[PDB]
Amino acid sequence: ATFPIMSNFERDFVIQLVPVDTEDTMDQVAEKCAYHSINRRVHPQPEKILRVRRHEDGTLFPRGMIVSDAGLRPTETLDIIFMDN
């Protein structure tokens, strides 16, 4: 259930290793990624929702979809972006 991804957090400068769980939703993946960027080198945006997209092809994952179902390669790079939805 522990599964490594690389987090490319919006408006940060660097991609980071973030362990996530195969049972996490995307929402829970974003929170684990935020911990390493928000309030470290990126300002919160409380009017926005954090979304997860596959870096390589730009595929947007729904909030509630879980890591298990996402078809990711171990260490896959994920963009964590600010959206209205």
Binding site: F13, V14, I15, Q16, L17, R41, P74, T75
Partner: protein, 491 residues
């Protein structure tokens, strides 16, 4: 009376003969010589433009050491190092750790050409080249040794390249690929032309001017003396490249050049760039890293390439754009991950430094400045724990540096991923990925520090475990060079 050099010089390199008791391919194995189907006779057209002979060498080089070691001995009791700007101390600790053993390792890279080049003039110049790097490795151990009692950091002048600390791995990755694991002709091109002629020759000139600007005449004289040796052996790639181009191998020659300039640049932007734009105190900054690059490195390459019948590398325009970005990332990476290096990084983001940065790089405050804004607020507000990391950055599988780029209002960080034989690779630029795909068996089963962490090789598998794996303990682990003094300007 004495002869004139020119009247007998050619006989010193009239040394090729036609072997008979062993074959030519046995005496010059292709994996070590890299003659590339070009004949012994065609390799004898090699003609180094800067000539020198044994008695001239030992006399001129004796006088160089007399001068450098005398300066060092006259200034040693003054203890300048104990009152130097701590960004300057850090610059030297980084320099010695990253370079001393690689200078020495170079001597072997020279020895590779001295034994295996089919060009007899290359074999003799590389014998002097071997002597030059013996000198550089030795003198760059003897100088910092004066400081071992001042702090452990100075032990890393000897120790660094014997560790798995990530900057050392990035150093060996670069040097083993350009000069230790390649055929003689490839070494002449990739090390002496691309890296020594192309970067380090002008880098040592700037470093010596900076040391004298900082008031460190020991180090100014050291760097300055070493720099005067460079061209004697740096000249060796030009003639190899002319031969390859004249004999139907321009594409192979181009490809070696493209790889070596890109890999040089990634190491240089990680270790020199931040020095110029952040460690040297504001009022000592002659020009910016980018200005240095445009004035002293880039036009010089273009002119060399033109004179050799070669092209600007495919990535040249990207490379120009990166001058505004790459090193700002490597600086922020090294400062944010400061406990993972063996010197103290200088933040360099005081109000006056940030206006200099804004003049030199319009848009800096809107981009880079954003991350530093967050970091600065945390330090003002007594949350220093949010300014050190709790994970590893992603590392490039080619350059072994963090994958980093423009943040803030113009976010542009990208990973150039590659799936290859069942494994996923990460690359910090398009050119880094390309160095891998043109020659995948040279790199395939190498693992970067992240790979090792993920495979179970670093145990305990946590940050303390990774620090021990890298040979780092308190006393050597880096921290902010001015002990956060610059935070006062923000309250």
């Amino acid at each position: 009376s004495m002869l004139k050099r020119e009247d007998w010089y050619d006989l010193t390199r009239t040394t090729n003969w036609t072997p008979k008791y062993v074959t030519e391919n046995e005496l010059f194995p292709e994996e070590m010589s890299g003659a590339r189907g070009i004949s012994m006779e065609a390799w004898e057209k090699y003609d180094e433009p800067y000539k020198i002979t044994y008695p001239e060498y030992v006399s001129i080089q004796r006088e160089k050491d007399s001068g450098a070691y005398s300066i060092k001995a006259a200034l040693e009791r003054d203890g300048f190092v104990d009152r130097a700007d701590p960004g300057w101390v850090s610059t030297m600790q980084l320099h010695f750790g990253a370079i001393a053993l690689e200078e020495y390792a170079a001597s072997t890279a020279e020895a590779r050409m001295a034994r295996f080049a089919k060009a007899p003039g290359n074999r003799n110049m590389a014998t002097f080249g071997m002597m030059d790097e013996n000198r550089h490795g030795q003198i760059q151990l003897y100088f910092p040794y004066a400081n071992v009692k001042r702090s452990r950091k100075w032990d890393w002048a000897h120790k660094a390249i014997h560790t798995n600390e990530w900057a050392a791995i990035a150093a060996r990755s670069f040097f083993d690929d350009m000069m230790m694991t390649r055929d003689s002709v490839a070494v002449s091109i990739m090390l002496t032309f691309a890296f020594e002629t192309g970067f380090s020759n002008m880098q040592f000139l700037g470093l010596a001017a900076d040391a004298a600007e900082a008031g460190d005449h020991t180090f100014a004289s050291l760097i300055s003396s070493i720099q005067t040796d460079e061209s004697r052996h740096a000249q060796q790639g030009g003639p190899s490249l002319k031969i390859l181009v004249e004999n139907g191998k321009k594409d192979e020659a181009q490809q070696m050049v493209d790889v070596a300039i890109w890999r040089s640049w990634k190491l240089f932007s990680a270790l020199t760039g931040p020095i110029m734009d952040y460690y040297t105190p504001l009022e000592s900054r002659n020009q910016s890293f980018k200005e240095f690059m445009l004035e002293w490195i880039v036009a010089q390459f273009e002119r060399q390439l033109l004179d050799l019948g070669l092209d600007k590398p495919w990535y040249w325009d990207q490379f120009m754009q990166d001058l505004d970005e790459t090193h700002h990332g490597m600086h922020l990476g090294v400062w944010y991950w400061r406990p993972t290096v063996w010197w103290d990084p200088a933040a360099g983001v005081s109000p006056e430094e940030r206006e200099w940065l804004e003049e030199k790089y319009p848009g800096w405050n809107d981009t880079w400045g954003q991350c530093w804004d967050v970091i600065t607020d945390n330090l003002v507000n007594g949350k220093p724990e949010l300014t050190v990391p709790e994970t590893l950055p992603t590392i490039c599988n080619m350059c072994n540096l963090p994958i980093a780029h423009t943040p803030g209002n113009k976010w542009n960080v990208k990973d150039y991923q590659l799936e290859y034989e069942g494994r996923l690779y990460h690359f910090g630029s398009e050119a880094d990925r390309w160095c891998f795909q043109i020659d995948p068996e040279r790199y395939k089963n190498h693992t970067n520090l992240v790979d090792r962490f993920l495979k179970g090789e670093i145990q305990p598998a946590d940050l303390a475990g990774a620090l021990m794996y890298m040979s780092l303990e308190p006393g050597v682990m880096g921290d902010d060079a001015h002990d956060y003094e610059w935070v006062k300007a923000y309250q």
